[PDB]
Each structure stands twice: as structure tokens, then as C-alpha cells.
């Protein structure tokens, strides 16, 4: 018996939109502490980590630890049947029930999604400290990645103490975008770094990551020389959604 009641159900809708484009199928580790998800994509180039603390739910029970393998494309498709103001319950007792209560309480929706059997495979995250940390509006990071993807396939990220630069080159020319550190709510840009860093990443994966933009007004970039990028979105007060991206040479 697992059952978790989420009043602001749009969170689950958004989380699966942030995952389906990158991961077709993944394994949910449910426990008393909450729900937890880690998976690399097929090409082993990126890693997504989902954390939802049980305290962020309005009701939570979990008798034994479970590990549900779910086709995320199927679960996303079911969650699109839920309204944005619905209250959503995940329930399990080889099937995953999802119950969508309209705000009225006169409409109730029950979906039973078949589960799938997956190889549980433990991911080793090496331990790592980051020179450069960039905090910036999530909406502008989305626009930066989307625009430069119309110029090239890869973006060169150069962080200096006073500003960060995004560059791409392609067959119709090349462009760069410079953000300065602000001195200003949730549209500020603040850099805290040690000494200059330059890394090259694939815009293809970054635009997968930015499907998480509806989850937060800000986004956090963590970098160091020759180590994967981390982009993390904080979910309201329940957890986060981290993406790791290996660099290009």
C-alpha cells in the first residue's frame, strides 16, 4: 500500500512533461521519505534526478519501500487527462492507480496504468565541487538555449566573475549572448564563482532540460573545468529536479 495525495496536482503534470522528452521509461523509488527518481538517457550523456519529499504532499503513506517501473510516455499521457486545478492521488497495492478529483468533488477520475519490469541499476554519482554557480531566471535560460539552437548544435559557456557568455556557431553565422550580474526578485542574475571556466555543451539536451521551466521562476547552473554541467529546478518546497550533462571536447 502506497498512497500520496497532492493537492496542487499541476506539479505532477509538469514533472512528467519535464521527464518524458528525455526518458521514455524509469523506476520510481518510493519510501517513507518520499519519491525519488534517477535515470540516464539512452546515450548515457545526461542524467535526471527527481526528488519529491513526502512533507510536500498533503497526505502520504508508504508501508514498504517500492520500486515501480513505469513507461513515462504512458504516465504523461494519462496525466494530460487531469485538469490543472485537480487534486491528484498516486495509489498502488503491478498497476499504478491515478485518481483525479475535480475541484467540485462531483467529478472523480480513476486511471489504472500498467507497470513494466525494469532492470534496477544503481547510478554512481561521483563527488564533485563546483567552481562557478549561476542563478538566473528560468525563462531567459530557456530563450537563450532555444535561440542559439537556431544557430548551432553546441553552446560554449564562459563564466567570468562579472558576467556569463553563451556562444554558438553554424552555417548561417554565429551569435553570443552576454548576461551581466544584476544587483536586483526572481528575474535577478547572480554569479558566484572562483576563477574563469569555459565549457561546451549540446543544445539538444539543454532544450530537453528546459521543459522543466514551468516548475520554477529561476534555474541554477553549476560548473567546473572538465566536469558535467548541473542544471537544477527547485519544486515548490517539496524537492528539486536535477539534470547532469557531460561536456564536449
Partner 1 sequence: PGQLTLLQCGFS
As given in the structure block, the three cell numbers for residue 67 are 520500486
Taking contact as CB under 8 A, which single stretch among the options 6-14, 43-51, 105-113, 162-170 is the one that binds partner 1? 43-51
Q: Which of 189, 202, 203, 215 binds its own copies (CB under 8 A)?
A: 189
Sheet holding 66-71, edge to edge: 66-71, 25-30, 34-40, 46-53, 239-245, 229-235, 218-223, 132-137, 190-192
Residues 197-236 that bind its own copies (CB under 8 A): none
Helix (H) / strand (E) containing 73: helix 72-79
Q: Which of 181, 213, 216, 222 binds its own copies (CB under 8 A)?
A: 181
Q: Which of 124, 162, 173, 237 binds partner 1 (CB under 8 A)?
A: 124
Cβ 120 vs Cβ 28: under 8 Å = no
146 scored as a contact of partner 1 (CB under 8 A): no
- Nearest distance from C-beta of residue 164 to its own copies, angstroms: 10
3-class DSSP state for residue 74?
helix
Residue window 69-108: x/- pattern of binding to its own copies, with contact defined by CB under 8 A = --x--x--xx-xx-------------x--------xxxxx
- Nearest distance from C-beta of residue 167 to its own copies, angstroms: 9
227 scored as a contact of partner 1 (CB under 8 A): yes
CA torsion, points 101, 38, 137, 53, in degrees to nearest 10?
A: 50
Q: Is 148 exposed, middle or buried (0-12, 13-18, 19+ CB in 10 A)?
A: buried
CA distances from 51 to 24, 79, 159, 195, 238 (A): 18, 19, 28, 31, 8
- Nearest distance from C-beta of residue 228 to partner 1, angstroms: 5
Taking contact as CB under 8 A, which single stretch among the options 120-128, 129-137, 157-165, 190-198 is the one that binds partner 1? 120-128
180 scored as a contact of its own copies (CB under 8 A): yes
Footprint of partner 1 on this chain (CB under 8 A)? 40, 43-47, 122-126, 202, 226-228, 244, 246-249
Amino acid at each position: 500500500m502506497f498512497e500520496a495525495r497532492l493537492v496542487q496536482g499541476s506539479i505532477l503534470k509538469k514533472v512528467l512533461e519535464a521527464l518524458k522528452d528525455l526518458i521514455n521509461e524509469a523506476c520510481w523509488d518510493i519510501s517513507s521519505s518520499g519519491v525519488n527518481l534517477q535515470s540516464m538517457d539512452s546515450s548515457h550523456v545526461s542524467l535526471v534526478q527527481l526528488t519529491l519529499r513526502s512533507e510536500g504532499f498533503d497526505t502520504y503513506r508508504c508501508d514498504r519501500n517500492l520500486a515501480m517501473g513505469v513507461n513515462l510516455t504512458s504516465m504523461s499521457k494519462i496525466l494530460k487527462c487531469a485538469g490543472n486545478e485537480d487534486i491528484i492521488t498516486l495509489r498502488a497495492e503491478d498497476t499504478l492507480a491515478l485518481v483525479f478529483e475535480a475541484p467540485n468533488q462531483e467529478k472523480v477520475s480513476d486511471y489504472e496504468m500498467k507497470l513494466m519490469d525494469l532492470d534496477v541499476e544503481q547510478l554512481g554519482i561521483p563527488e564533485q565541487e563546483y567552481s562557478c554557480v549561476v542563478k538566473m531566471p528560468s525563462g531567459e535560460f530557456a530563450r537563450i538555449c532555444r535561440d542559439l539552437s537556431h544557430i548551432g548544435d553546441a553552446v560554449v559557456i564562459s563564466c567570468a566573475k562579472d558576467g556569463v557568455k553563451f556562444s554558438a556557431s553554424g552555417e548561417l553565422g554565429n551569435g553570443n549572448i552576454k548576461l551581466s550580474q544584476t544587483s536586483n526578485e526572481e528575474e535577478a542574475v547572480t554569479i558566484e564563482m572562483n576563477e574563469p571556466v569555459q565549457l561546451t555543451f549540446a543544445l539538444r539536451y539543454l532544450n530537453f532540460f528546459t521543459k522543466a521551466t514551468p516548475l520554477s521562476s529561476t534555474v541554477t547552473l553549476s560548473m567546473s573545468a572538465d566536469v558535467p554541467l548541473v542544471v537544477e529546478y527547485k519544486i515548490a518546497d517539496m524537492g528539486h529536479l536535477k539534470y547532469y550533462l557531460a561536456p564536449k571536447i
